């Protein structure tokens, strides 16, 4: 639903799912050929799956291709200043 | 303090395989995959590959593949490499590099020492 | 992949001088370039993570522009711990290329 839906909310409001209660397969994203960029800051895809959180949450916005950059952690931009900034202590995963 | 410690001075006849070691303290074995450079005088650094920990996933740049190869224990946090059939060629220096994070594409933040190999 | 090929063979600027370190990419990646600082006998270190952000422990001098297809790294002065190599990466794709190295000398 996140990943594959008609419209989703745009980079000027970013929605939030809070994903928890569940078990989840981050290789079966991981092994997926058609998602090219996969910044996954923190800890590593292989052992998402072992690692227990106590929540997984959710993003889903529209960037440009070149201010796809802009969503990491101590950038500065377009989007990065104005629309949507990252904590320089972020831990997650990033697909476009 | 983040310490990456090499073993360094590698000389072996060619035709033979060498064992390289990359022990890592200070920070997270498991949060941080392991990376891997070769400094060539030549015409610069070069990419080797992609280990992540205590698995055997893995992923050789199609400058190295074949002789390249990867190892990683999780215990004493070493990564490995045992290159057989080492030629005149290949007489560098190798850098294990740590990321700054475990997921791709990253810059290797940190660089610890360098294993010189040589052929002798 | 991506393949690293600078523009600069070698940089010959003075102390405080105002210049320019140019790599070019192989073809237009947007901005993902990175630097490091390779002293002779020295391991690389980084000095910008990224084309035009700043990373902790980074002198105030270095500071880079990312046009999208020829980065380049402007430096407003020049001291002795700056003589080093600077390489540049493209993290865009899995497959990494680094930098030939600039030297830089006096």
């Known amino acids: 639903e996140v990943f594959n839906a008609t419209r989703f909310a745009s980079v000027y409001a970013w929605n939030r799912k809070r994903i928890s209660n569940c078990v989840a397969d981050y290789s079966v994203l991981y092994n997926s050929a058609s998602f090219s960029t996969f910044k996954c800051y923190g800890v590593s895809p292989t052992k998402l799956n072992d690692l227990c959180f106590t929540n997984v949450y959710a993003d889903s916005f529209v960037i440009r291709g070149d201010e796809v950059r802009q969503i990491a952690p101590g950038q500065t931009g377009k989007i990065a200043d104005y629309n949507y900034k990252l904590p320089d202590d972020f831990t997650g995963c990033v697909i476009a | 303090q983040v310490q990456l410690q090499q073993p360094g001075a590698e000389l072996v006849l060619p035709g033979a395989s060498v064992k390289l070691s990359c022990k890592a303290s200070?920070?997270?074995?498991?949060?941080?995959?392991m990376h891997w450079v070769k400094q060539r005088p030549g015409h610069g650094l070069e990419w080797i590959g992609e280990?992540?920990?205590?698995?055997?996933?893995?992923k050789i740049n199609q400058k190295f593949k074949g002789k390249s190869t990867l190892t990683v224990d999780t215990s004493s946090s070493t990564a490995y490499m045992q290159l057989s059939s080492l030629t005149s060629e290949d007489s560098a220096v190798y850098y294990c590099?740590?990321?700054?994070?475990?997921?791709?594409?990253?810059?290797?933040?940190?660089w610890g020492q360098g294993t010189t190999l040589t052929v002798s | 992949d991506i393949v690293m090929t600078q523009s600069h063979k070698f940089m010959s600027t003075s102390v405080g001088d105002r210049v320019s370190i140019t790599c070019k990419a192989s073809?237009?990646?947007?901005?993902?370039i990175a630097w490091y600082q390779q002293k002779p006998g020295q391991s690389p270190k980084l000095l910008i993570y990224?084309?035009?952000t700043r990373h902790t422990g980074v002198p105030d001098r270095f500071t880079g522009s990312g046009s999208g297809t020829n980065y380049t790294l402007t430096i407003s002065s020049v001291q002795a711990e700056d003589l080093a190599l600077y390489h540049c990466?493209?993290?865009?794709?899995?497959?990494?290329?680094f930098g030939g190295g600039t030297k830089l000398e006096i």
């Open positions: 590099a740590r990321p700054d994070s475990s997921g791709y594409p990253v810059y290797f933040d940190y």
């Open positions: 200070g920070y997270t074995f498991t949060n941080y995959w």
């Open positions: 280990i992540d920990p205590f698995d055997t996933y893995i």
């Open positions: 073809q237009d990646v947007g901005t993902y």
């Open positions: 990224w084309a035009s």
């Open positions: 990466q493209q993290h865009y794709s899995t497959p990494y290329t």
